[model samples]
Target: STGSATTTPIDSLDDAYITPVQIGTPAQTLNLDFDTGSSDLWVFSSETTASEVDGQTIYTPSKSTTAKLLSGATWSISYGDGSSSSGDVYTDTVSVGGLTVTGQAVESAKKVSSSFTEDSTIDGLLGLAFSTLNTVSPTQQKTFFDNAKASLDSPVFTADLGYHAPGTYNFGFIDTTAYTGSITYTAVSTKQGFWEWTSTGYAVGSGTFKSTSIDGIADTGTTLLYLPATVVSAYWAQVSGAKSSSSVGGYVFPCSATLPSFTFGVGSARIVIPGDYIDFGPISTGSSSCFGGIQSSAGIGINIFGDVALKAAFVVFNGATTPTLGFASK
Candidate 1:
């Protein structure tokens, strides 16, 4: 079965894309972050202590006749950035796009870190990563996508994440109209629970392409492109007045500084990230201080091709066969 859904960035944060999803019978609809970096379908719920929740909408399972408690089961998750949440589990009907699945595990939050609790607009997160990464205890739970894959015609999904614009996430089908040019496919290693793959090499602007194999994850939930410290330093060195700022968190450069395009190699295919996109807005409007979307992934182990890089192209996550990724200019 094929389906589709509209994804829009949180206008204020411009960090994550949010989509509408209906959970349980009688349909308790919630706006969730469509995160590909993690595996877990969780939401703010009545189980969350009142004091722990801020202004988020909570899912009341008692009102949905189709909600069934998975007794003795619970889930707790922490992101790379240290944001975390923990809750109990329930099985219910979950609908997204035009697809629906019964007995989908729904983690209802009982506690959440400030990062999640303070984000009033984000009710929860719907993870699109491999089911093996799910955090449910007693037994791991499958994501909504995993539960519905059997009914899907091709077991594939496409993420068309746009920069400061509405995007579309299509399930079980590819919309050729959304992108142009030939799609380049790359094999991925999912042993790490991520869409992990290696780029043949890279280059800064029209510079010579270095044959340094860079292993990274295509993460929609992240907002910046993270590479090894050496790579990051090399890139910033080309920009005058660019420096790492512990207070600013990462590297910052003068807004007026000319930036060169960044390119990554996938076999013989080259996907280039425009310099304009690398400007990742500014530290503050009318301020000369600007943050470079590319940063150091040093301690994180794997590099991350976050929105800054992913938005430069259309991406296809194929669950069929060896789980390859297809990318093309948007």
Candidate 2:
């Protein structure tokens, strides 16, 4: 995250956020998307086909003396539909924001879908979800965070997503100075291998909170907020000219149209997503047709309160005995 002019425009958008990770001896730092929606610390590597490179950074196992290939191990993961990637495995020293883990299983991409080939901002993905979601066969391995949890001062990590800035991810402890008021925590059901939970209610703008349970997952990897179509229509109805068309790939409205802020509940906590945050910039840099950050989860079944919601508060993924999610407003 940066305010520098040299930084790419992708970071300022709702596409996804990436953090620098060092993944080899002599420390090869690469920008990696920390995804909580999936579990697999796979990366673009020296072994990737030349056509798949797309100028992204690659993690080379051969360049590091500490890298050790896991002889019989191979990993292949599909993203439920068509997008997928598969690769070989290696164990190496990997670190993020000074926290380090040795013998961490690092999957090297041998084959990747076109979706991955086009995204040049991230070299690969560092999954923070539970290890059960890992795709490695024969013997699945723990995530970097899972492996480093016990050694940390606290088995928790926090994410600070910014509205239009570079926020941070901190491990081991909470930074009370970063947020206002006490944090409100709710139980998380990791049974599905996701940080899934239920929101008690929600309100559009200053509307009254509706007492309905909205079950969803807090995924840092996802770019937008996906709720029930009924709820989405309610929110979009407040906008002057918002419409959902498969042709346009979801809801799109005039850039100048005023949008109501979205507020959702976590226990007694009420976190508000600023109206402006819902306007995920224009469809094109100069276009006036703006896309919405909140979409309908008509087909997905479960709601995904992703980066759009997380950017409004301080989120903690507590990996303790009883895993729970903690939310604190800034």
Candidate 3:
């Protein structure tokens, strides 16, 4: 418990989400977004009255027995989807599994919106990967990896995010249960924690694809695969009726149409994107339009392959150390 601090423990909240290990207990549950853009693990504070705070497990210092607020430090976050929030900083002892991480930082939101604030089931965000995308300060930032390092025995981290399959959640150390073969680790760029790709182009469905020559960055923070509109058009052209229905979400074609075994180039290695990924459900923009496997975020600064693309591989973000990225099953 925080010294002389009076706090309350929120046992359960009505959210369909997972909490970072530190904030979760055996009984008390947390709902957090697995954000890849940032490295820190933060939750909305009780002070957050906005809609985003609903169903979220916020640390109300007034309610938590072991919570402390760093009122002097203020915080804010702006999402790529054009949403943001601001609040004060607070620290508390968060528990996950059989471990405890003290002084975990949480944001107390003064405001939130439907894009982010609307979720009542998701408690907080769990940024397990690199911290280059942190809303908090880079140098002063503390990530789950940073905080978890103290409690966990092994100093390694791995991500086994799956979609159709029952997704996995492993902690304490790297789980090599299904991990087969040698893992290839790329040298650190020393700038951010993004994975550097030695491009060979990406493949979709059963057809082979050629990328528009790029020395790109592979990031998990993004949800969709952002590419040039023309290139997206070119690739989808290979799909049946894709050209006509390009605007639809999930690149939906007739279910009878077999998807190509899509793949991406990394150095001399080719990493395949599973067919299930191409089976996007619907378009957020137009209901009738077909969602292309690759979408155009043309004006966006950089071309990025988001989390949907990372679902297949085992990703590792090492920041406390030299800050390198390791991909398992290479």
| Better model by TM-score: candidate 1 vs candidate 2 | 1
Segments of candidate 1 deviating more than 4 angstroms: 284-287
Identify the leading candidate in terms of TM-score. Answer: 1
TM-score, model 3 to reference: 0.77
Error of 1 at 170 (Å): 0.8
Candidate 2 per-residue lDDT, tens place, 45-88, comes to 99998898897999999999999999989999876325789999
Candidate number that wins on TM-score, 2 or 3: 2
Can you write out model 3's per-residue Cα lDDT over 1-330, one digit (the tens) per residue? Answer: 101111111222101124344442223345566555555555666677754555666655676666666757766777667867766666766665445667777665666667666655555666654555556642355765567675566565555655544344444555566466656666545355555444557665566567545544555546566765665665566667655343343345554455555576654455677655665543444454434455665667666767556666766655446656566642
**Of candidates 3 and 1, the better by lDDT:** 1
Best by lDDT: 1
For all predictions, the C-alpha RMSD in Å is 1.5, 3.2, 6.4
How well does candidate 2 score on lDDT at residue 303?
93
> Which 10-residue window in model 1 sums to the lowest lDDT?
9-18
Candidate 1 lDDT, 1-330, residue by residue in tens: 988999888774367788899988799889899888999999999989898788888899999999999999999999999999998999999999988999999999999999988888889999989999999999999988888888998888889987778888888888989998888999999999999889888899889989989999989888889999988998999999999999988999998898989998877888899887788657878888898989999788889999888888889998876899988887
TM-score of 2: 0.95
Per-candidate TM-scores read: 0.96, 0.95, 0.77
Clash count, candidate 3:
31
